[PDB]
Every structure is written in C-alpha cells, then in structure tokens.
Amino acid sequence: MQLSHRPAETGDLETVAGFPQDRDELFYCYPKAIWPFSVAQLAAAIAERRGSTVAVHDGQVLGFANFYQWQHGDFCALGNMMVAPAARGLGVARYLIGVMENLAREQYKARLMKISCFNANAAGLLLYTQLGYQPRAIAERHDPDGRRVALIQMDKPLE
Numbered sequence: 001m002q003l004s005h006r007p008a009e010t011g012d013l014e015t016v017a018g019f020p021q022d023r024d025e026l027f028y029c030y031p032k033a034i035w036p037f038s039v040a041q042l043a044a045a046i047a048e049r050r051g052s053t054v055a056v057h058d059g060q061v062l063g064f065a066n067f068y069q070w071q072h073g074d075f076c077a078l079g080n081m082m083v084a085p086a087a088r089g090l091g092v093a094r095y096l097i098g099v100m101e102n103l104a105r106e107q108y109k110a111r112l113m114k115i116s117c118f119n120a121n122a123a124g125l126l127l128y129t130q131l132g133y134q135p136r137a138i139a140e141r142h143d144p145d146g147r148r149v150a151l152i153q154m155d156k157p158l159e
C-alpha cells in the first residue's frame with residue numbers, strides 16, 4: 001500500500017459518491033443525506049465543511065473525509081469518512097484519519113479530534129478505538145425510518 005493524499009477536486013466527486021453501498025453506509029458517514037447519494041449532496045457537504053481530502057493509491061481515489069466542526073486552538077470533528085468498497089479493511093481509513101489529525105494540528109492548532117460513530121457501525125467503533133479514540137458520551141439520534149439510534153461521541157488528544 002502506497003497511499004498519498006490531496007484536497008478533494010470536482011473530478012473526484014462521482015467516484016466518492018459511489019462509495020456508500022447502501023442506506024446504512026450512507027447514514028453512518030452522512031446522516032443528513034438522503035438515499036440515493038448524489039454528487040450534488042456530496043458537493044453540498046464539501047461547500048459547508050472544511051478540509052475535504054482524498055486518499056489515493058495506484059491512481060485510484062480510495063478514501064474521503066472532512067471536518068464538520070472546527071474551532072481554532074481547540075478541536076476539529078471528523079466526518080464523511082468513506083472508503084471505496086474494493087479497498088475496505090486495507091488501511092485507507094487509518095491512513096486518512098492520520099492525515100486529518102495532522103491537518104487539524106497544523107492548520108487549526110487543534111488539541112483534540114472528535115469522531116462520532118453510530119452504534120451499528122462496529123467496524124468504525126473498533127477502528128477508532130485502535131487509533132486511540134475514547135468514548136465520551138452517547139447521544140440519541142433518529143434514523144430515516146424514525147428509529148432511535150445511539151451516536152457514540154469519541155475523542156483523542158492530538159500530539
């Protein structure tokens with residue numbers, strides 16, 4: 001694996017919007033979005049967020065993430081974490097989370113990264129745990145069917 005990163009570009013949008021494979025996956029990474037996902041929905045998030053970044057390997061965009069909260073000197077909140085379905089479990093999210101930690105430290109002077117993860121996303125919860133994130137709170141949210149879900153609010157000090 002020889003991963004690189006760069007800011008997200010218009011030409012990446014169709015690729016990245018292809019990453020969520022079902023309503024659950026879209027919910028876990030972008031709960032405000034409505035299935036089916038679209039480039040317009042992805043662009044809307046990019047426009048209102050900061051730091052949208054892609055991970056690339058062998059000419060393929062394999063990952064995407066951004067910040068939906070940012071407070072200089074304080075923290076950033078990382079979301080829209082998406083990984084190409086053929087590249088799952090190969091370290092792309094771990095790589096990109098590390099890049100986003102460096103961005104938060106360097107650009108925003110953040111002392112903390114927040115990551116919130118829905119309860120059903122076991123793989124996410126375990127990944128963020130392996131990367132040193134700890135659970136701080138659990139918040140109630142509602143899914144598209146009106147069912148109650150638990151949002152696990154985690155954080156990690158940045159060094």
Ligand SMILES: CO[C@@]1(NC(=O)Cc2cccs2)C(=O)N2C(C(=O)O)=C(COC(N)=O)CS[C@@H]21
Pocket residue numbers: 028029030031032068078079080081082115116117118141142143151
């Ligand atoms: C403002 O916080 C968020 N939204 C809400 O909590 C509001 C709602 C949630 C469910 C119904 S309404 C927001 O935006 N979030 C994102 C995101 O879109 O990136 C994620 C995805 O996180 C990752 N890890 O990719 C977790 S919920 C959190």
